[PDB]
Structure formats: structure tokens, C-alpha cells
Ligand binder design. Structure first.
Ligand SMILES: *[C@@H]1O[C@H](CO)[C@@H](O[C@@H]2O[C@H](CO)[C@@H](O[C@@H]3O[C@H](CO[C@H]4O[C@H](CO)[C@@H](O)[C@H](O)[C@@H]4O)[C@@H](O)[C@H](O[C@H]4O[C@H](CO)[C@@H](O)[C@H](O)[C@@H]4O)[C@@H]3O)[C@H](O)[C@H]2NC(C)=O)[C@H](O)[C@H]1NC(C)=O
Ligand SMILES: *[C@@H]1O[C@H](CO)[C@@H](O[C@@H]2O[C@H](CO)[C@@H](O)[C@H](O)[C@H]2NC(C)=O)[C@H](O)[C@H]1NC(C)=O
Ligand SMILES: N=C(N)c1ccc(-c2ccc(OC[C@@H]3C[C@@H](CC(=O)O)C(=O)N3)cc2)cc1
Ligand SMILES: *[C@@H]1O[C@H](CO)[C@@H](O)[C@H](O)[C@H]1NC(C)=O
Ligand SMILES: [Ca+2]
Ligand SMILES: [Ca+2]
Ligand SMILES: [Ca+2]
Ligand SMILES: [Ca+2]
Ligand SMILES: [Ca+2]
Ligand SMILES: [Ca+2]
Ligand SMILES: [Cl-]
Ligand SMILES: [Mg+2]
Lengths: 454, 466, 216, 214
């Protein structure tokens, strides 16, 4: 409602670097807010795409940003009569970024990995890897829970059980308030998908450069399954956390599986031990139900509510015809120990192929009325197809069915304006939470400052 | 007695006809002061109104083109007729309605294009062997239904990129079957093999030179191939006047839009053709799989009839996709494609077993209603689609157009066309709301308030600006 | 905390078999590799092999191929090392090791299991007094413990009274039996002025003999 | 297999010194080396992994360094707990191999030993054996040589030696030599001697007795 669409702020990266593919706010030890931006096709040293991360100080004018430097060199270790190998070419560093406390977690989901033992090998597969940084001190660390040293022949003998070679860990990322990093790995267990959790402090303390294969004892990975409903489900495409069981000491996980049960799509709510509490099934096949999940209390009862995006949902129209427009589902958490019922509200896009619901950002309380609000993105929507971000305000009965404000893309055609969103942080310190929007197609980020309600 | 034409008390010839389709206007000078000028045509002549000064438009419908339905789609140079009439003239007065008919025939011996788009992953190695004679076997069976048969062939596996594709050792790129004890082709997304031709022995010989590849994940990139086989008309060689059949065979799940993000691919499918001179899909490693919505739009645009010939283990999956892509047929393929021949013939019978009408460019103020005559002269009101037809059957529809008020544009035209058919009925509509005597009005007449008004059709109207 | 608690010391005969254990404490045995290392005073440390308890896949040094068999039961959180066709040269201390962070390291160690292979039966020692020959300011006595099996033996002077100025030497293997000796040093005005006794306890055969030293 | 040459075999140092153990491999191992510690009569404790990295809980006075095939463990300012055994281990290739070991020992001033000879007891002679015991107590350094002589002539068959660890009090070593003969062979001769060769005296310290005579 009260986002200023006139005086925007634009940050920009190098051409073709996909600057803005992912973003987040970052507060330093002094509470100063900055913006961390991933650019998963930033050129490395060998003039080859490796990705990169930028840490942008807040300026009303915007501009260029300094790089948050990471080691982009391929690594090799000859240990235990074996040869360990990491390959950082086309790894997509910055395909997801997330900040917690004074720590930045940037992930390269397509970093490849292989192990050689004489004439056998583990196969060069994308296990993924995340890089951690404390910008004020200069500390660095890595976390790659799917790296293994099992040779290819063994996987075939054991029939590919517990095969973590294609995890692509870091595809999606989130950090609990207690500091436990939760990584989505949609390719784990032969494209079933897995989740990896470990404390941030233990990642830093148990990491040494050049080891390549090391243990994090406090880590916890999800479990393989023989149920075909999970086959090629990409369980872990999107991840989020919240409180859904009434006990405030436990933290619950929300996992998107957009091709679960033969492309039906599903979202599951689990405890910290990966035991399933609820499962929201998709409505329409190939809609990619679970492409994006968001957690925030919208109706102001203190109980977190769940939002699910299905950006390929095809709406029914006249003459038995279907129009791919996208849809968002709202689930309000009931009072006490009860199951999440049918959706409380259906928000459906308008522009054909607009992919409404591709990104959902909790905004906090934008208009300061007492109810939290959200932003939904249609990266190819709007009358021109340049992209749209729609703001929906919270109310006592859930959300308003019509938007309160619509942000049209200030970038040319094909910028994917809205593909990545982040809100609920006051960056200019005026008392109102603000919204950053990524447009990786144009290699830019736009900052919308919230203003007093007109 | 007084009717709605009198009791409304109209002011002009134009407002008179707008009351009801039954009213008329009398533009005669010699007319009593107390007698109204806007009555039924019977009452006006009863009151000695000159028959030439009577404005009474009658809604009608006359045919302009009316070729006969052809008996054989064979021969001719797209001169086959399957819809009759092809063009009619329509004239409607305000708030009136008129009816007309249209005949549709599923013509016998109509040319056919069949493009065989085959999964060539490692599990299809046995299937390739059992269709070596298909081109001649199929030419024998379709010869009973048509005399213009053209067949082609394409092949797909998946996006040749990690992690779908093995990328180690270096040998595995040239031969993915390296760690086995055989040789197979390097990975390929989709390759066009044979342009649609009537020389069916070219099919057998191109098939005998084909071989399979091998990838890592069960879902295959078939939808990438369906898209390219559709939007690349000139390379596949679809004919203009022919039933286009796209046979899609696979024994596994398929990738859908947004799956490509697991390979670093985020650019949406642009629905354009990207098969160059090398006959390989060049955007396979840079462009995401197509979405069901985008496939539907292109299949409908090119009049392609997609056929899902899949094995039992994935029939339910593709039956559900078929529900989301109208006009699609499903058949149960055997584990070696040995039954693919009969599967194709039954699909062609099921495809042409339906006639469904569609309306394009209908003006906002026009509304239609349909009555269908399927089977033996059995009228079905409120329906616009017949089912259960055989090659050579003929159906007909009764249509009624109802106009609301009078639109600004006095001439519009819309189309009635069966789904997938080449011919169509063009309905040229003309809204007759004006009077012929308005073309001979007297602006600034001496008879009307010392020139302050205009004399038309025998009455005084206020001039412009008043 | 990480702690590896192994089985107690074993005492076996040649040609027989023994199965050692290594129980994980404060963690899951399935987490990392588990090695076994053999230690002897002369030959030093030797690496036997490893096992991944998650799947049961083992590696071995070709030297131990045949005698060593490594297994693991994730249920009891315990790893095992079985030795077969035991020999005199298999008498050693055996440790189980696991790494800290590095997948291939050797950081945390159990307390060790003492293995002794011998055909000797449970024999009681022979305690002999060692008085000097027929002068100075210091005098030194002795006590000889010969031909006992198995280890160990506790040795005190005057029942733990005279403690300072004593040297008890490590036992030595003399033809399948053990021999131990101890000396004590005092002043000339103490002996033979004060009675000095040699207390030897062999709890295996349950004998506590005492020999008082007498001059010549 | 990879041979681990660890040097020196032992060193005599004091509290507060800065010492350096070295380990040399038969080929490059690229920092794939670990360092171990075994306190007297106890188990092992890890010190270094991957060449330079401290194990959790180890004080910072330890440090590892080196590359290729030559590595070094250094202890800055020795503590009283640091006197123990130390081993290097490589895991660059299977099988894992260890170094010979290095023992840190307390340094002090030299001290000549207190020799003492003891004829066979009355009880042992009546049973059929005869053991002459020779005690060599409290000396430094540890390097010592014992020699048995029967009627002035050297004897090497039937000797049984035993040493103690460095004493906790005075930091000296001690040794026990035992010559065992039959009763019949013990009486064929008259003079029994054990000579002690230490660096504290160019002349061997001699102690002996004569059978029957006392
Ligand atoms: C292709 O598409 C078809 C239809 O779109 C799918 O078939 C349906 O699958 C769903 C899920 O498996 C089935 O839903 C279940 O319905 C049961 C009741 O069915 C009765 O009623 C229907 C008419 O509505 C009849 O046709 C049917 O024969 C029965 O008489 C419920 O009992 C089930 O509820 C239980 O299970 C769900 C999870 O499955 C739990 O969440 C619930 O809490 C509860 O425990 C369930 O709702 C549906 O019946 C199926 N229809 C048909 C016709 O088969 C295919 O699965 C799909 N295939 C692929 C490969 O995509
Ligand atoms: C389609 O069929 C319906 C019958 O269900 C027709 O409706 C009737 O048409 C007659 C025509 O004389 C009227 O007398 C009836 O009053 C109509 N009944 C209704 C409208 O309920 C309809 O006219 C037919 N239309 C066409 C275009 O054929
Ligand atoms: N998490 C689990 N429990 C789990 C889940 C799935 C799988 C799994 C493994 C291998 C599969 O097959 C791949 C290719 C396809 C085909 C030929 C081609 O198309 O190239 C061929 O032969 N191999 C399919 C599925 C294993 C384990
Ligand atoms: C229109 O309908 C009338 C009666 O329903 C019928 O007599 C007439 O033939 C119809 N017109 C056409 C063109 O079919
Ligand atoms: Ca909780
Ligand atoms: Ca709520
Ligand atoms: Ca609000
Ligand atoms: Ca603000
Ligand atoms: Ca087959
Ligand atoms: Ca595939
Ligand atoms: Cl047709
Ligand atoms: Mg296949």
C-alpha cells in the first residue's frame, strides 16, 4: 500500500552475471543494514563462470557494490590412497544467499565433486556446496554434507540407496533464529531430495582449509525412502521455518516438493527430526505446487501461517479452456493441536504465463495496522509482460483477496523482475519495513522504501 | 388498438424501429395529426400510408457461398469442402434474432501426416528393433483409410548436461555405455531424422540406422521434442491440408517446466524453433522444458493431434496430462512397441470421431445458441459437439443469433469453425438500425421552427447543438 | 564427549581365538571410520585396518590378512576386532581409533586392551630373600619373585611401611613365566637392627607369601 | 609402503625449553600427517591432524609444520606434563604407517650408579636353581652396559635384564640384571662378578663375591 514507486534505488552488477538471482538483508554487529546479493554467473579467475556474492552498503542512490570474496580455485587432495576433487566451474555461487546475525551463507548448488581410486571413480556429480563468511572479521568456512568417498561400483551393488552424489545442497537455504542452517538438496537420494541441518558455529569450528572431506558431528540429514511417491519429487526445492506444533522450544521445518507424487506437488511440515507433521498436497499436476513457501502470521493471532506458490497453475476459463497464470495458497494455523485444513484463500494470477506465485516474501506490517502483509511476484506478468509484484495486506480473517499496491517493473523485457524477493527489514531506519526486488535478467536490484500511509 | 409501438410515443424513425422488431414507420406527408406514424405494418396500410414510405426492415439470412460437401478428400488441390455453407450474409434489426444452419462432414480419404517421435533412452533398445518394418506395415494399413500418407521420424533423450548426463570419465561423453560392455551414442536432446515423406521405405531404412543413448535420471526430456516438432513446420514438413498426427512413445516419466533449474537452466521456453541445419535442438542446454500451457497453445496453433503411446507403468500419468491438454489421445504401448501399429490406427479413428464447433471474433452484443444433430436425425438442444462419428459421417447444427440493442459499428463478421478443420463458415453481419429516408434528410428546414431543426422521414428533429 | 571404551584385558592360549570390543560413548559409532592399531614395545605401532560401520566395508594391511577380522554392530554402538590362530607374536596392546574432523585422521583413541597369548598355567611365584655378602653407610637388600603366571604382582616392604628408597623392576618373561625383582636402600643402623619383610601378593593363584630378609 | 623415519629416538631436555621433533617420509605425503602423544602407562592423545591443525583441547604451545616429505612437531616452553612418547603417522596412502617414536626425558646432572651383588638364597639352592642378582640403582644418563664374568671370563647365556622408567623424584634410572644357572653349574666355579660401564667413569665399576667364602 505505502511502498514508494517513484523514487527507487538501483544496485547493479556486471553484465551477464545474473546479479540479483537471490538476495537478503544483512545486519552487521552494529545493526547497520546492508544487502547481500548473489550473482551465480559472475566470471572467476580463468574467465569462466563461477558465480559471486556482493555486499551492498545502503545508499539512497545505489550503484556498484564490493565483492564478498571466496576461494574460487579448484581443489585436489591425495589422501587415503584416493584423490579428492572439487570443480567450481559453473557452480553457480550465489544461486541462494541467506544472512543470520553477522554471518552470510552463500551457496553454489552446482559445484561438482569426484573421487578417484586407481581406475575407479565416484563419478563427477553436482553435490553442491555453501560458503560462509563473517565480513567484519574476515573468517571463512564451507559446508558440503553430501560429499562422499564411495566409488561408483558400490552404489550399483547396493542399488543406489543413500546416494547423495547429486544433492545440489544449497539449492534453497534458511537459518533458524537459534543459528541452525538448513539446506535444501533437491537431488539427494537419487532425486528424491534431502535436507541438511547443522549449527553455524559448529560449521565454523569444524572446518579447516584443504580437508575437502570432514565430519560435522552435530549435523542431521533427512532419510532416504522407498516410496515411489517421492521419486523425482525434488523434496527440498524450497525451504522455510516456523512454529507449527505449539511448543516454542522446537523449531519446525517447511519443505517444498514441487514434483511429488508424479508431478502433483506437495509441501510438508516437519519437526527438527524430519518426522512429518502435515502434508499439503497439490491441486493440479505440473503446477509446481511448492515452488516457493513462506511463513508469517497474517491474521495477527500469534500463530504462524503458511503460504505456498504454484506459478504454473492453469486456471479454468470459458469454453473448457485453461490459462497458465499461477496461484498462491494461504493456510491459517488453527488454535491448538489440529491439522491444517483446506486453504483459507486462493490468489490467482491474471496475465498468461505470468508465473504469479513464483516468489513470496513476508513483508512484516507494511501499513502498521497490526497485521503482517506479504508480497507476491509474477516475474513475467503485467500488461506488458515485464513483471509485477503485488502486495496483499493482512486482516483478521486472513488476507485481502485483492492487492493494495502493484509494483510494475522498471527494467526492460526479460529481466525476471520479482524472481527473488525479501522484505520485513527497515533499511533506511524510518520506522517502516522495506522491500528489495531482484531482476537477474537485467543484473540489477531495486529497493522500495516504505513511507507513511497517505 | 394501441400496442407498444404507439404507447411508447417515439420521436423519430430510428427510435421507432428500436422499440420492437415488429414495429414500422410511415414517412408520408398526408397523415392525420392524431394518427401515430410508428405502428404495425398492417395498421399503417390500414390508415392509407403510402407503401413506398413504409420503413420496415425484416431480419433475414441468405447464403453467399454454398459449395457441396465433397465425397472424397483425395485428389483436388485443397479444393475439398467439409463445411457448408462457407459464407452467409446476416441482417438483424435491434433486439431481434435470426437462425441459420451449418453442415460438417468428416471427409473420407483425407491426407494424413504422421510424425514418429520416439524415446531413445537405453530402455528403448528393444523397441527400436521391433519397428524396423513399421513404415511398410503402417503404409499397408493406412492405405485402407487414405491415399495421401506422409510419415517422418524424430528422436529424443534428455538435456545433454549434468546431472542428467554422465560427465566422467572422458570416455563416457563419447560413449555413455562405457562402464557396460556395449557402445551407444553420445547424449542428445532431440534430433530430427526424417522429414515427412510418402516414400515409406525411407522410414524403415532411417530406423535401421538409429541407436539408443543413456542418461542418469528416469524422467526424459520428451516435452522439449514435442515443442520443436510442432513449431518447426518447414523442417518436419507438415502439410497444410492434412490431419497432423504426432506419435509420442516413451516408457518413463517426463520433465516439465521448471525442472531445468537442477541443471542451472532458468530461461523460460520461448516456443520458437531452434533446430538448425544439423537437425539437433541447439537450445537444449540453455532453455527450460516447455510448460503444458505453452504446448497447448502451439499444438492448437499448428493443428497437431498429439498421441501419448506409453507403457502401462505410466498410462495413468499421461492420461492425467491428456486431461490438461484437450484433443490429446492416449494408447497403451507394449514394452517393445510391438503393438504400436494398431495403437496408431485406433487413435486416428478416435481423433476423427468428433466434431466440435468453435466461435472466433464474436461481437460482444451477439449471443449464440446451438442445437446438434448427431447419430440419426436426433436433435440435442444446447449442444455444439458431436461424438462417436465414423469416417464419412455427416452432422449439422441449428444456430440462432440474438443481438442486444444496436451497436455502433453497423457491419461486423465472425467465424464458425470445427476444431482442427481447415474450412469454416464466415458470417457477415449487418446491423440494420437506420432508415433509408435518413439519407435524404433536410438540415435547417423551413418547416421546423424557423430553421432551428432538421426534417427527416416526415418529422422535425432538433438540430445539432440543441 | 567422545569416548571409546574397550573390553578388558584378555588372557588366551595359542591356536585359539579372541574377539575384542570397542564401545562408542557420547556419539554414534556409525558416524566415522573405525581403525584398529597394534602396539608392541619393539615393533612399535602397526595399523591393522578400518571399517565403516554404516555399511560394513573394511580395509586391511596385507600383513594381517587372515588373522584380523573387523566387524561392527550399530545396535550396541560397538565395533569388534577378532583375532584367529593366535601366536606368541600376537601378544600386544590393541587400540581402536577414530578421527575428529578429517575423514582419514587418527585422533580419538580408546584406553587399550592388553592381550597375552601363553600356554603357561596359573603358577604361584617363588619368593627368595636377597641379603648382601659378608660395611658402608648405606645398605641395600633385595627380593626375587621367579616363575609366576600370569601378571601382575603387588610388592611392598613391611606391608606398605617402608616405601621411600625402593625400586621395583618391571616383570620379564622367562620361558612362559614371569620374573620380578625389587630392591630397597636404608642406613646401616637400620638393618639388621629392624626387621625388614618382603610382602608378595599373587591374586591369580591367591597367595600372599612374606619372606623376612636375614643376613649371612 | 611409506616408511616413517622419526628422529631423534630420545632427547634429554628441561622445563621451559623449545624442542622440535622431526619426521621424514619415503615420499611426498602433502601434509597428510598426524601427531600422537602417549603419557607413561596410558593411552594415546591426538595432537595434530593434516600437518598443522590442532586437535580440540590441545594447548597452543604445540605446533605442526612442514611440507612434502619433511614435517616438524614443536613444543614452545615445555610443561611437566609434556614428558611422554610422541609418534608421527601418515595417512596419505593405505596402509597407514607410524614412526618409530620419540621419548622426551628429564635432563639432569650425571650420577654414577650404586652397584650391589647378591648370591643365590638358601631356599633357591635347595630347589635346584641358582640366580645371582646385580642391582644398579640411581644413575644418569640411561646409557649403560652390564657384563657378567664367571671366574674372570665373560658370560652371556642366561642373563635377564630389566630397567625402570625415569624416576619421578630424582629423575634417575635403575637396572636389574639376573644371571640364572643350575645348582650343579653354579658350583663348578668360585668367582662371580658383574661389571658396570657408564660414562661417569672410564674404569668399570666392579662388584663381586666368591662362593663358599664369606
Ligand atoms: C491421475 O489422476 C487420477 C484422478 O485425477 C488420480 O486418481 C486419484 O488419486 C487420488 C489420490 O490417490 C484419490 O484420492 C483418494 O480418494 C479416496 C476416495 O475415492 C473414492 O471416491 C472417488 C470419487 O471421488 C472414486 O472414484 C473412488 O473409486 C473411491 O470410490 C479417498 O479415500 C482418499 O483419501 C485418503 O487418502 C488421502 C491420500 O491419498 C489422504 O490424504 C486422506 O486423508 C485419506 O486418508 C483419497 O482422497 C482418488 O480417489 C483417485 N481417483 C481415481 C479415479 O482413481 C491418479 O492418482 C493420478 N495418477 C497419476 C499417476 O498422477
Ligand atoms: C433448439 O431446440 C430448442 C428445443 O429444446 C428450441 O426451443 C424451442 O423452440 C421452439 C421454436 O418454435 C419454441 O416454440 C419453443 O418455445 C422453444 N423452447 C424453449 C426455448 O425452451 C430452440 O428454438 C432450438 N434452437 C435452434 C437454433 O434450433
Ligand atoms: N532414494 C531411492 N530409494 C532411489 C530412487 C530412485 C533410484 C533410481 C536409479 C536409477 C534409475 O535409472 C536411471 C537410468 C534410466 C535407464 C535408461 C536411460 O533412460 O538412459 C536406465 O537403465 N538407467 C532410476 C531410478 C534409486 C534409488
Ligand atoms: C429457421 O427456423 C425455422 C423454424 O425453426 C425453420 O423453418 C427454418 O428452416 C430455419 N432456417 C434455416 C436456414 O435453417
Ligand atoms: Ca515448535
Ligand atoms: Ca495465524
Ligand atoms: Ca499490515
Ligand atoms: Ca523503511
Ligand atoms: Ca523396451
Ligand atoms: Ca532423463
Ligand atoms: Cl480433419
Ligand atoms: Mg529412459
Amino acid at each position: 500500500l505505502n511502498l514508494d514507486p517513484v523514487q527507487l534505488t538501483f544496485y547493479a552488477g556486471p553484465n551477464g552475471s545474473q546479479f540479483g538471482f537471490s538476495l537478503d538483508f544483512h545486519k552487521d554487529s552494529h545493526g547497520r543494514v546492508a544487502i547481500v546479493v548473489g550473482a551465480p554467473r559472475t566470471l572467476g579467475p580463468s574467465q569462466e563462470e563461477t558465480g559471486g556474492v556482493f555486499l551492498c552498503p545502503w545508499r539512497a542512490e545505489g550503484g556498484q557494490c564490493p565483492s564478498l570474496l571466496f576461494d574460487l580455485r579448484d581443489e585436489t587432495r591425495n589422501v587415503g590412497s584416493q584423490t579428492l576433487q572439487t570443480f567450481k566451474a559453473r557452480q553457480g555461487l550465489g544461486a541462494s544467499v541467506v544472512s543470520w546475525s553477522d554471518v552470510i551463507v552463500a551457496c553454489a548448488p552446482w559445484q561438482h565433486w569426484n573421487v578417484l581410486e586407481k581406475t575407479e571413480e565416484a563419478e563427477k556429480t553436482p553435490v553442491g556446496s555453501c560458503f560462509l563468511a563473517q565480513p567484519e572479521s574476515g573468517r571463512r568456512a564451507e559446508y558440503s554434507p553430501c560429499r562422499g568417498n564411495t566409488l561408483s561400483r558400490i552404489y550399483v551393488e547396493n542399488d543406489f540407496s543413500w546416494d547423495k552424489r547429486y544433492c545440489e545442497a544449497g539449492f534453497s537455504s534458511v537459518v533458524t533464529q537459534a543459528g541452525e542452517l538448513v539446506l535444501g538438496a533437491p537431488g539427494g537420494y537419487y532425486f528424491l531430495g534431502l535436507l541438511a541441518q547443522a549449527p553455524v558455529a559448529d560449521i565454523f569450528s569444524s572446518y579447516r582449509p584443504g580437508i575437502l572431506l570432514w565430519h560435522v558431528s552435530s549435523q542431521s540429514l533427512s532419510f532416504d525412502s522407498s516410496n515411489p511417491e517421492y521419486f523425482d519429487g525434488y523434496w527440498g526445492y524450497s525451504v522455510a521455518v516456523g512454529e507449527f506444533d505449539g511448543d516454542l522450544n522446537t523449531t519446525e521445518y517447511v519443505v517444498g516438493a514441487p514434483t511429488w507424487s508424479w508431478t502433483l506437488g506437495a509441501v510438508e511440515i516437519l519437526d527438527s527430526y524430519y518426522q512429518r507433521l502435515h502434508r499439503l498436497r497439490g491441486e493440479q499436476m505440473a503446477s509446481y505446487f511448492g515452488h516457493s513457501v513462506a511463513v508469517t502470521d497474517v491474521n495477527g493471532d500469534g500463530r504462524h501461517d503458511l503460504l505456498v506458490g504454484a506459478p504454473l497453475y492453469m486456471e479454468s476459463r470459458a469454453d473448457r479452456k485453461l490459462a497458465e497464470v499461477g496461484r498462491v495458497y494461504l493456510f491459517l494455523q488453527p488454535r491448538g493441536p489440529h491439522a491444517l485444513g483446506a486453504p483459507s484463500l486462493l490468489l490467482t494470477g491474471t496475465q498468461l504465463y505470468g508465473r504469479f506465485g513464483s516468489a513470496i516474501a513476508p513483508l512484516g506490517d507494511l501499513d502498521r495496522d497490526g497485521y503482517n502483509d506479504i508480497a507476491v511476484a509474477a516475474p513475467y506478468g503485467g500488461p506488458s509482460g515485464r513483471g509485477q509484484v503485488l502486495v496483499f495486506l493482512g486482516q483478521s480473517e486472513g488476507l485481502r483477496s485483492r492487492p493494495s499496491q502493484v509494483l510494475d517493473s522498471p527494467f526492460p523485457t526479460g529481466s525476471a523482475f520479482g524472481f527473488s524477493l525479501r522484505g520485513a527489514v527497515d533499511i533506511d531506519d524510518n520506522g517502516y519495513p522495506d522491500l528489495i526486488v531482484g531482476a537477474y535478467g537485467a543484473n540489477q536490484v531495486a529497493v522500495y522504501r516504505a513511507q507513511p500511509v497517505v | 388498438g394501441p400496442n407498444i409501438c404507439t404507447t411508447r410515443g417515439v420521436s423519430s424513425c430510428q427510435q421507432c424501429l428500436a422499440v420492437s422488431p415488429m414495429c414500422a414507420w410511415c414517412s408520408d406527408e398526408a397523415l392525420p395529426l392524431g394518427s401515430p406514424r410508428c405502428d404495425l405494418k398492417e395498421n399503417l396500410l390500414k390508415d392509407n400510408c403510402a407503401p413506398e414510405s413504409i420503413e420496415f426492415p425484416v431480419s433475414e439470412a441468405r447464403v453467399l457461398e454454398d459449395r457441396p460437401l465433397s465425397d472424397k478428400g483425395s485428389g483436388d488441390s485443397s479444393q475439398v469442402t467439409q463445411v457448408s455453407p462457407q459464407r452467409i450474409a446476416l441482417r438483424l434489426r435491434p433486439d431481434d434474432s435470426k437462425n441459420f444452419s451449418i453442415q460438417v462432414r468428416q471427409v473420407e480419404d483425407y491426407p494424413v501426416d504422421i510424425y514418429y517421435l520416439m524415446d531413445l533412452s537405453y530402455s528403448m533398445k528393444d523397441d527400436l528393433w521391433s519397428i524396423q518394418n513399421l513404415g511398410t506395415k503402417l503404409a499397408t494399413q493406412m492405405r485402407k483409410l487414405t491415399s495421401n500418407l506422409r510419415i517422418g521420424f524424430g528422436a529424443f533423450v534428455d538435456k545433454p548436461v549434468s546431472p542428467y548426463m554422465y560427465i566422467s570419465p572422458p570416455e563416457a561423453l563419447e560413449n555413455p555405455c562405457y562402464d557396460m560392455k556395449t557402445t551407444c551414442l553420445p547424449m542428445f536432446g532431440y534430433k530430427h531424422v526424417l522429414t515427412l515423406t510418402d516414400q515409406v521405405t525411407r522410414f524403415n531404412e532411417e530406423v535401421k540406422k538409429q541407436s539408443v543413448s543413456r542418461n542418469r535420471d528416469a524422467p526424459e526430456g520428451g516435452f522439449d521434442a514435442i515443442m520443436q516438432a510442432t513449431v518447426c513446420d518447414e523442417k518436419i514438413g507438415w502439410r497444410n491440408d492434412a490431419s497432423h498426427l504426432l506419435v509420442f512413445t516413451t516408457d518413463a516419466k517426463t520433465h516439465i517446466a521448471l525442472d531445468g533449474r537442477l541443471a542451472g537452466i532458468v530461461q523460460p521456453n520461448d516456443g520458437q524453433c531452434h533446430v538448425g541445419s544439423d537437425n539437433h535442438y541447439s537450445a537444449s542446454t540453455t532453455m527450460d522444458y516447455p510448460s503444458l500451457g505453452l504446448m497447448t497453445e502451439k499444438l492448437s496453433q499448428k493443428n497437431i493431434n498429439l498421441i501419448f503411446a506409453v507403457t502401462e507403468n505410466v498410462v495413468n500419468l499421461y492420461q492425467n496430462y491428456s486431461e490438461l491438454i484437450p484433443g490429446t489421445t492416449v494408447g497403451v504401448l507394449s514394452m517393445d512397441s510391438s503393438n504400436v501399429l494398431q495403437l496408431i490406427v485406433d487413435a486416428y479413428g478416435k481423433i476423427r470421431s468428433k466434431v466440435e464447433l468453435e466461435v472466433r471474433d464474436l461481437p460482444e452484443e451477439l449471443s449464440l445458441s446451438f442445437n446438434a444433430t448427431c447419430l440419426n436425425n436426433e436433435v440435442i438442444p444446447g449442444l455444439k459437439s458431436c461424438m462417436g462419428l465414423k469416417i464419412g459421417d455427416t452432422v449439422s447444427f441449428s444456430i440462432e443469433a440474438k443481438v442486444r440493442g444496436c451497436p455502433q459499428e453497423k457491419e461486423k463478421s465472425f467465424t464458425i469453425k470445427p476444431v482442427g478443420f481447415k474450412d469454416s463458415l464466415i458470417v457477415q453481419v449487418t446491423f440494420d438500425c437506420d432508415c433509408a429516408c435518413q439519407a435524404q434528410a433536410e438540415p435547417n428546414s423551413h418547416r421546423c421552427n424557423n430553421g432551428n431543426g432538421t426534417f427527416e422521414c416526415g418529422v422535425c428533429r432538433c438540430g445539432p447543438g440543441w | 564427549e567422545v569416548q571409546l571404551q574397550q573390553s578388558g584385558a584378555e588372557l588366551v592360549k595359542p591356536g585359539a581365538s579372541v574377539k575384542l570390543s570397542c564401545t562408542a560413548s557420547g556419539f554414534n559409532i556409525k558416524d566415522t571410520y573405525v581403525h584398529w592399531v597394534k602396539q608392541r614395545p619393539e615393533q612399535g605401532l602397526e595399523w591393522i585396518g578400518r571399517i565403516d560401520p554404516a555399511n560394513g566395508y573394511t580395509k586391511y594391511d596385507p600383513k594381517f590378512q587372515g588373522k584380523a577380522t573387523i566387524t561392527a554392530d550399530t545396535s550396541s554402538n560397538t565395533a569388534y576386532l577378532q583375532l584367529s590362530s593366535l601366536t606368541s607374536e600376537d601378544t600386544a596392546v590393541y587400540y581402536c581409533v577414530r578421527p575428529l574432523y578429517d575423514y582419514y585422521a587418527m585422533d580419538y583413541w580408546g584406553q587399550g586392551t592388553s592381550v597375552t597369548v601363553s600356554s603357561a598355567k596359573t603358577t604361584a611365584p617363588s619368593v627368595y630373600p636377597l641379603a648382601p655378602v659378608c660395611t658402608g653407610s648405606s645398605v641395600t637388600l633385595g627380593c626375587l619373585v621367579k616363575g609366576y603366571f600370569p601378571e601382575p604382582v603387588t610388592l611392598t616392604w613391611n606391608s606398605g611401611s617402608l616405601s621411600s628408597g625402593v625400586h621395583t623392576f618391571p616383570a620379564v618373561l622367562q620361558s612362559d613365566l614371569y620374573t620380578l625383582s625389587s630392591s630397597v636402600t636404608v642406613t646401616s643402623s637400620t638393618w639388621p637392627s629392624q626387621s625388614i619383610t618382603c610382602n608378595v601378593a599373587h591374586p591369580a593363584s591367591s597367595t600372599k607369601v612374606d619372606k623376612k630378609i636375614e643376613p649371612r | 609402503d611409506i616408511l616413517m623415519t622419526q628422529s631423534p629416538s630420545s632427547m634429554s631436555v628441561s622445563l621451559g625449553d623449545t624442542v622440535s621433533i622431526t619426521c621424514h617420509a619415503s615420499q611426498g605425503i602433502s601434509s597428510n600427517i598426524g601427531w600422537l602423544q602417549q603419557k607413561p602407562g596410558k593411552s594415546f592423545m591426538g595432537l595434530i591432524y593434516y600437518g598443522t591443525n590442532l586437535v580440540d583441547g590441545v594447548p597452543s604451545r604445540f605446533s605442526g609444520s612442514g611440507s612434502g616429505a619433511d614435517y616438524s612437531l614443536t613444543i614452545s616452553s615445555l610443561d611437566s606434563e609434556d614428558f611422554a612418547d610422541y609418534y608421527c603417522v601418515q595417512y596419505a596412502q593405505l596402509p597407514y604407517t607410524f614412526g618409530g617414536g620419540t621419548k622426551l626425558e628429564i635432563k639432569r646432572a650425571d650420577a654414577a650408579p650404586t652397584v650391589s651383588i647378591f648370591p643365590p638364597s638358601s631356599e633357591q639352592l635347595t630347589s635346584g636353581g641358582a640366580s645371582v642378582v646385580c642391582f644398579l640403582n640411581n644413575f644418569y644418563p640411561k646409557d649403560i652396559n652390564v657384563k657378567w664374568k664367571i671366574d674372570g671370563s665373560e658370560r652371556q647365556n642366561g642373563v635377564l635384564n630389566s630397567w625402570t622408567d625415569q624416576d619421578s623424584k630424582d629423575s634417575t634410572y635403575s637396572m636389574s640384571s639376573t644371571l640364572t644357572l643350575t645348582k650343579d653349574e653354579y658350583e663348578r666355579h668360585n668367582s662371580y662378578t658383574c661389571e658396570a660401564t657408564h660414562k661417569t667413569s672410564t674404569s668399570p665399576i666392579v662388584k663381586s663375591f666368591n662362593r663358599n667364602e664369606c
